[PDB]
Automatic annotation (TrEMBL), chains A, B, C, D:
An example Gene Ontology molecular-function term: nucleotide binding
Family the UniProt entry places it in: Belongs to the Glu/Leu/Phe/Val dehydrogenases family.
Name of the gene encoding the protein in the UniProt record: gdhA
Gene Ontology annotations for the cellular component aspect, listed alphabetically: cytosol
Subunit and partners: Homohexamer.
Site (Important for catalysis): D154
Protein name: Glutamate dehydrogenase
Domain Glutamate/phenylalanine/leucine/valine/L-tryptophan dehydrogenase C-terminal, first and last residues per copy: 190-457
Residues that bind substrate: K78, Q99, K102, G153, S386
Lineage: Eukaryota, Fungi, Dikarya, Ascomycota, Pezizomycotina
Record bears the keyword RNA-binding: no
Entry keywords, A to Z: NAD, NADP, Nucleotide-binding, Oxidoreductase
Amino acid sequence: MSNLPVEPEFEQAYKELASTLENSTLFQKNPEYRKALAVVSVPERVIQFRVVWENDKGEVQVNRGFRVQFNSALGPYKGGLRFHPSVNLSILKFLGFEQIFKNALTGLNMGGGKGGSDFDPKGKSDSEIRRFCVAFMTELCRHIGADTDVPAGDIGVTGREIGYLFGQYRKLRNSWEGVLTGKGGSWGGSLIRPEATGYGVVYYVEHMIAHATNGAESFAGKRVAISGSGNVAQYAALKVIELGGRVVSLSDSQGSLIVKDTAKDSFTPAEIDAIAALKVDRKQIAELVTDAAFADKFTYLPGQRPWVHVGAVDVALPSATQNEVSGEEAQALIAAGCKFIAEGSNMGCTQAAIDAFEAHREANKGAAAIWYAPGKAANAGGVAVSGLEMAQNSARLSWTAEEVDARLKDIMKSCFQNGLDTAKEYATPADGILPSLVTGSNIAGFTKVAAAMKDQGDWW
Amino acid sequence: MSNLPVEPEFEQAYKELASTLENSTLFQKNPEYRKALAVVSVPERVIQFRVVWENDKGEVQVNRGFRVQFNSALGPYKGGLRFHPSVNLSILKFLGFEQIFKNALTGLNMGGGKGGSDFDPKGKSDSEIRRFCVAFMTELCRHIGADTDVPAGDIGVTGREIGYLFGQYRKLRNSWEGVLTGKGGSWGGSLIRPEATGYGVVYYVEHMIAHATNGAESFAGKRVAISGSGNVAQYAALKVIELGGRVVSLSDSQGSLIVKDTAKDSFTPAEIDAIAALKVDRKQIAELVTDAAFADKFTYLPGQRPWVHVGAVDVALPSATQNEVSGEEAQALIAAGCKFIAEGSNMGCTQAAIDAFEAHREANKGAAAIWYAPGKAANAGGVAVSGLEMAQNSARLSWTAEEVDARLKDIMKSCFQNGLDTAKEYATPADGILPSLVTGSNIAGFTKVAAAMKDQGDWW
Amino acid sequence: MSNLPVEPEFEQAYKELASTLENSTLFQKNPEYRKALAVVSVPERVIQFRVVWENDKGEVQVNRGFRVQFNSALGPYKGGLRFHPSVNLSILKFLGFEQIFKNALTGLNMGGGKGGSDFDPKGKSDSEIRRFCVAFMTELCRHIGADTDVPAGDIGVTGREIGYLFGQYRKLRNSWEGVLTGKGGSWGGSLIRPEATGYGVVYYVEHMIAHATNGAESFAGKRVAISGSGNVAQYAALKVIELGGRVVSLSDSQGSLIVKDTAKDSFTPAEIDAIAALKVDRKQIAELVTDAAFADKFTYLPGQRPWVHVGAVDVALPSATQNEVSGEEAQALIAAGCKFIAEGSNMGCTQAAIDAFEAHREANKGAAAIWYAPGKAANAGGVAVSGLEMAQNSARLSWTAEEVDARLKDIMKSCFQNGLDTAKEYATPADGILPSLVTGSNIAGFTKVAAAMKDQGDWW
Amino acid sequence: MSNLPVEPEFEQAYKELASTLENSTLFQKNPEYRKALAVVSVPERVIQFRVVWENDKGEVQVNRGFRVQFNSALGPYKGGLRFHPSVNLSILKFLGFEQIFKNALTGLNMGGGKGGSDFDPKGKSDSEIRRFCVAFMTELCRHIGADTDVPAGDIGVTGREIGYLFGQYRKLRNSWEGVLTGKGGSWGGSLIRPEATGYGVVYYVEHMIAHATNGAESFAGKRVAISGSGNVAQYAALKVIELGGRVVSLSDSQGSLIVKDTAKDSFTPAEIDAIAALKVDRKQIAELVTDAAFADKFTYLPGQRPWVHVGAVDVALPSATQNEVSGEEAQALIAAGCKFIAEGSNMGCTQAAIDAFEAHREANKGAAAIWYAPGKAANAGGVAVSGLEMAQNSARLSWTAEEVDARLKDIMKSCFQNGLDTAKEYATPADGILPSLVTGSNIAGFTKVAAAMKDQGDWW
């Protein structure tokens, strides 16, 4: 086994999934699925190519491009593209593995997969981005198609990158098919989709707190621990503020925007839009918080996570990146008086932190228990709108806003019902104790994907 | 002409169609279409390949696979797959020839064609079926495409076979297109279709009896001579019994399930479901009828068709296979007091039997005439739902049950009107005598297909 | 098994081969190969399409086109095209089955297969042939390629047909590859091939008589029973007379050109060229016998095969078609005193005739035994030249005549040695009795093709 | 950023090449090439797929398959396939990187690359190997083409594996092309394929001993410490014995085979054939020692390398594995009085061992001076013959033994001439201090491949 490379993130995801699948009743009823666990983990195809482009000064730059087509039991490969200098095979493997069950759990077509490169859009001109995208799509075009691969956007691939990539794909394939997602008016995309990711994340945040109180309490007198900046965080803030939700955290990556007067003062939507605009301009908070209005609205404590100075937060909502909540930070969250760890990223909670949360929740019988929130259960939404975008791209027509948001908010609800009805009593007995949601979602996705693979002859 | 091979079933079908087209006012008005009759009868492409698979004991097995793409004037080739040890080129040619006008008559745009193999799923393990499907799909996938060929199911190809075939096609083509019909939740199919065969069959059975009485008499106080033990019999029974439809026949293949008390006692739906379950378990009516409830409900007379012991049947519904009603059995039907020969399969009535039925009907002026019922004039619901399944496969979305059964029951009705309005006075003078249906249906299909071929330049 | 169609010629060939392989030491040593006999007899692909063309009067004509890709264990599919009104699937199946072992025995890197149509070039204008070729090439070009199918010429497909077919293939494929054989200066073909049809025939005729006498007697004082007219029969005749070869038979199909003075008078080569020219002009041997220069040479007896009036022929050379030597005619040959039945066609000897020849040869111990000559053991000269033509088409260059006829006559000799050495004591004990040639040839082909299929994983 | 994974063997290869290119005159003259070093080191396409096959007991087995297409500057990607339960991305990357300059140095028009899986052919039946090959070729066909990818054989992929893979490729693509290397004589003939590489290392050693001693030493009366069993080691032994040398080592993974009488004792060619026969069955050489002839001539050394126990040995040829010559073993070779260390595999010597060998190379001017010979410099010829098969596959022909042997002789001679021509220009030879050979080889390959990439626009 030592011959196989070690991928820490992917390995941790597999360990978590195996642990949750083991302590369950689906395994005992159908032991065959254990053999399925052998075939899900191996990606169906992993492609790693070399991208050679020309920078502004006229020099040759060489980067690596990855496309991890993990599983296509349920539909065509559907995953994003991440242009981040930290991208390698482990990260994309883990993200695609999560994507398979994210697309299965929320009752969609489309399979898993994830693409990207170690390209860094930071500090690059427009021409440099254009040249890299043109070179990247040449190497990638051989492996994507309207039914083969539909790459999407992620951290790094904004509207501009997706535009360049579509232009080159149309150049050298002479096709004009619905092969990428994230387009718009001048590429023939769909509404909501460019802002779907934040849409979906905030949808799941509000839904997760509503089900956290079981609908017995809106955000009245509730402090929210939003994380991140720019996209996702902006929409989360603007739809959390609506129900009197006291916003007390928008730590982008190092600078924590925590209100000095945690009791009364809260953020305003125009301020959040300014924050998003500043993040668009590739800048830290800095001049944002140093402005007089922002200076009097919230205090700045850079270099520490908001978990140190939560100011008795009501809901913990980490949404920056993976492993954004450490063990000591998780214990600080628990002691502060939080019963809802509504993490809004992929593996944003440290494995030790998740273990501590589970132990405390099973040791906190009653409404005053820390309810967990696994990443793949939340977020989504963007994937659904990307699916709708490809669906209307197939139809050679553009759906209206009412039609699109009626397709959504009517789907994903049946999918929530499916997830909760699968997690009715199977696994995590919850005999008087709060149930587990990781054990509510892992099996809820795994059963469907394993069924799909078994019914096609993938594993027997 | 002796150089051309002799196909008995295909030749019989061609003789029947030519005879009905000859005695028509379409022929005399447009003699050109005679030469069209030369071009329809030649299939556009017939592919016969060799399938080499490995059985359970580790031996090599060699079978033959056929794909008869007959005609695509109206749309892509659309036809089922039949895995039956009696399959050869004649059977598939005849079935595809019927399929062309079945798809033309009922307003569907898809073309004709039919596939299959001499494989026998009886007595084969799951692994044997899987292996054969994988080999078959390789050899066949060379010649199919989402717009080229969309194979469907038939006698032999259940959900499992279609699942295996789709899995292999997705393997070696890297596509995931809507290239086969008969999928479901774990392959991305459609609703209604898994029950479409029985759905459409019983729809047409009730339609044909309703048109038989012209709405004057529902199934109240009527004995129905259902045949077979497939969906064609199952749903037929379930939705004939609703209108007081006394059931007096469920002969699977040799064992006639005829009620001992033909006057009062009838079948029950739970018993029909039990028969379904045991047929799924690859068992005949044996061990069903022997049960006490089934013993007191109906008597068993194996080795004879139910026509000898109809018990004064009201409507005869032969639905087992081709040539299930012989001349003497047809005369027994006529003598018993049946005025509705409702053959619910393809070529289920023997040519001589059909001639006798027509001769008697033209000599039985009045409501007491034996009204005919050709196969392609019915049994189109399954085809319609398969078309809808392909249509929603193209759209990258899943229709609801209400949407699908609103598309149906609204189509096929305009198509029935089209057929009857085409056969209003065209041939068959019917001056006080009951008109013929085989004739009217033949012209109603042939005119549209010949028009399409003339308009595309196939024959001039 | 009755579901399988009955092919007379193919079944006869399969029976002959099975009987030959049964009475051998190969079966007993390796019983595994018996199961190989199940997989060879099923063609890998059989395609039958519909060809719709326009005749001179402006009417639509519909014909059938066949392409039987039988086996490709050894190389790409390599078979001819036959445009003859008697062409169906049985004939092409049998011809392709023979072709597989004809290409295996002669040490060639080419597979089997055979194509054709029921088109009749007789009585057709140039334009009619052109139009049919264009339509046929469209439908066929869907399923051929340089490494997929290389159709060749046969009875019906002259240089003109092959020219038209190449032109259309280059039109709609935009390729110009070596996809057909039988081209020339204006299509980029090869030398030797324009006369290869007669080249190979006469090569194998002279070689077979030389082996018949074992080199102990040239054609001095020998009467030859050549069959046919022109081309194959012509070039056969030209290099038989050279060794004082007395020619006493050039029966085209019904009119036997047998010399009145069988003792002294013989044919001349300008006369045979005239015969070939007249056959090119689509004229039988009628006016040719009327001329005094030909009238004083041979007597005309239409309606009988030349076996009735052999005039004590020395060597029998039936080369017209299949089953050209019947049982009674074979016994006439035996009574006349022929010890060399050198049939130069495929299945030219009737099964009963073959049995009688074998019985007499095993009952005629000594040099005065009727030595057999199977078709695939004969011919094969043109096959090699077509292979060389494809080989130099791959090389993008043209070989000289010396180069081509040095490649040949140096190959086919090692191949004859292979064929005879593989039949060295491999059954047919021949302990003082003349050995059998059908046995040797059949085993020598079958072992190589079965080895190739076993080594590629076709049968295990 | 350490986002790049760890590829230890690839790291050693790249470090060695960079160190060689630094300490030279190539970089100082042309500093441009420093960017070529960055561009060449990225594999340019890496495919990793998942292979799912059914074993003998009927269970699902999942493995990983790799294709590393490093460079196609000089020709289509050309590398082997290695089925061995230790194959991962690092191993195949390193092997492909070596192969690029191995194909560049010896004047070949093919590129780099390497494929394989962690399949373990040992302990599997024929059926299990067949099934795995079929699944592997199904998953691999999309990335394989005659002008795209021509995989070859290596440790694991014998004649049978190649046969199965070709057979599956032929039915999937419906094309017979020379896309794989190692095929049988009948189908894609391969002459002098096994024999090529074995004599190459001894040729290199004989040329170097001729040059080094100013023609004062020859291979007569020398001891050879060749290692490994089969292929290269066998033919190395045969060549040493044939010339007049004495073989004193045929060690393998488990133990060693040292002649008891080191002065006069060798291994007979019949004994070597027995070794080959037993190694075909994958059994250990230990039992081979237990044979009476071997028991009275050789002493087994289980779990120990022979190069410290043979004692005074003239020539060391560790052709078994990579990194099988340790630092302490290198100094043992120093003490043993070895004069020329040559590798039968890539990266035969440990980095420390290579350093010690090169440091001690400069001393002992004239004879002695154990002199490093990397794998690329010696191991060749077999790759050349593989290329020749591609040529023979392109021409649709089959070359004779004399032709292919003459081409191989010319190719090896040109390779040696060009390798030794660019010797002193970029490497420092001091004054009679035994100039380095690894440096010469590295520069001679890198200059040509960098030139090709610069001329095609890959790096500027």
